[PDB]
Amino acid sequence: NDTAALLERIRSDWARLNHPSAGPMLTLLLLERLHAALGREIERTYAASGLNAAGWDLLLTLYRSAPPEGLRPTELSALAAISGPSTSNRIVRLLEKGLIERREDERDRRSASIRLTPQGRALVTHLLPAHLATTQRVLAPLSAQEQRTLEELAGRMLAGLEQ
Amino acid sequence: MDNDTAALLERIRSDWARLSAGPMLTLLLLERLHAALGREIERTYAASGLNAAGWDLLLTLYRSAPPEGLRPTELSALAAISGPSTSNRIVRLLEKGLIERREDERDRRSASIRLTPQGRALVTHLLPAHLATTQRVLAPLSAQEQRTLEELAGRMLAGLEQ
Numbered sequence: 298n299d300t301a302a303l304l305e306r307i308r309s310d311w312a313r314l315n316h317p318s319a320g321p322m323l324t325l326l327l328l329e330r331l332h333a334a335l336g337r338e339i340e341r342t343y344a345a346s347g348l349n350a351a352g353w354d355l356l357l358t359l360y361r362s363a364p365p366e367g368l369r370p371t372e373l374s375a376l377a378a379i380s381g382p383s384t385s386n387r388i389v390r391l392l393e394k395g396l397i398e399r400r401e402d403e404r405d406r407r408s409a410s411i412r413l414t415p416q417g418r419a420l421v422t423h424l425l426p427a428h429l430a431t432t433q434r435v436l437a438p439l440s441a442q443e444q445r446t447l448e449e450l451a452g453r454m455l456a457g458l459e460q
Numbered sequence: 461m462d463n464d465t466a467a468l469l470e471r472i473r474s475d476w477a478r479l480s481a482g483p484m485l486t487l488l489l490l491e492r493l494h495a496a497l498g499r500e501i502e503r504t505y506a507a508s509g510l511n512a513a514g515w516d517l518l519l520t521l522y523r524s525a526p527p528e529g530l531r532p533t534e535l536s537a538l539a540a541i542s543g544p545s546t547s548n549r550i551v552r553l554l555e556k557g558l559i560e561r562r563e564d565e566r567d568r569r570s571a572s573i574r575l576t577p578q579g580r581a582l583v584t585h586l587l588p589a590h591l592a593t594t595q596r597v598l599a600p601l602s603a604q605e606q607r608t609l610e611e612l613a614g615r616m617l618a619g620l621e622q
């Protein structure tokens with residue numbers, strides 16, 4: 298009843314219908330199922346804090362990439378790992394939570410630089426050990442060499458889509 | 461390119477080093493690949509008003525349902541997407557006229573679901589572009605490399621499902 302069993306079934310079903318390869322469809326189904334399973338695991342680190350993936354990405358980005366003065370929105374967006382429609386209003390949402398700050402009482406207020414508040418920094422510091430343990434855990438089935446091979450293969454696919 | 465994911469992941473790597481980030485970076489790559497794949501794949505059915513959940517259901521019926529259709533438990537089990545995004549997709553596809561119910565004559569609560577002629581026509585029309593697109597996004601990898609990707613991804617997923 299696991300994904301491997303389902304994928305052999307789906308492969309068998311396509312072969313029956315096609316007797317037009319289902320090969321690529323099945324490879325991407327595996328990657329899609331893996332993405333979903335990873336997300337259910339990774340998000341447990343920050344779920345009890347009220348953060349979604351978009352919010353955690355922003356906080357981590359400030360934590361690892363912001364200089365002391367903070368990051369203005371264009372730079373912050375470029376250094377964040379998630380881009381797209383799911384990022385809508387994540388700055389507003391994290392401001393209302395009190396986890397990030399910026400001086401709204403100045404001109405160019407929309408471009409004002411953003412920083413972690415003491416609470417935001419404390420939250421990231423609190424949660425990061427479980428994130429590091431979890432990201433390591435979900436890759437543990439693979440050896441060092443296998444993780445490197447995986448990154449290279451996945452990287453070449455992504456390069457093809459971005460070129 | 462200094463603005464693609466490879467360049468971003470190198471910056472993130474160096475930033476953590478200045479502050480192991482290895483595992484985080486591997487999963488970031490997989491996450492960004494998932495997003496990019498979605499943006500390509502969904503263009504096949506976007507103009508028909510279907511979302512990923514709907515396309516999954518229609519395709520599941522196409523390849524896996526017998527002529528009499530699939531009852532909901534079996535249909536959910538043979539579909540590739542499970543979880544919160546599949547909420548109400550049967551309802552939505554019924555309202556669209558792409559699937560229909562074959563009601564049980566004794567227990568009207570139970571009924572098998574199948575493609576309508578319109579649903580079947582839609583899948584047939586769109587499937588060539590789906591096959592071309594899924595082949596295209598994998599074309600950077602050789603056949604052997606695609607098998608290797610599957611072995612490695614499969615072992616990771618098995619670890620999460622065991």
Ligand SMILES: O=c1[nH]c(=O)c2[nH]c(=O)[nH]c2[nH]1
Nearest residue numbers: 354357358361378379472484
């Ligand atoms: O430096 C990061 N590490 C992550 O694990 C991660 N996840 C995410 O969404 N953004 C980031 N950024």
Ligand SMILES: O=c1[nH]c(=O)c2[nH]c(=O)[nH]c2[nH]1
Nearest residue numbers: 307322515516519520523540
């Ligand atoms: O047999 C399938 N092929 C796919 O490419 C696909 N995509 C999806 O969501 N479900 C399915 N099912």
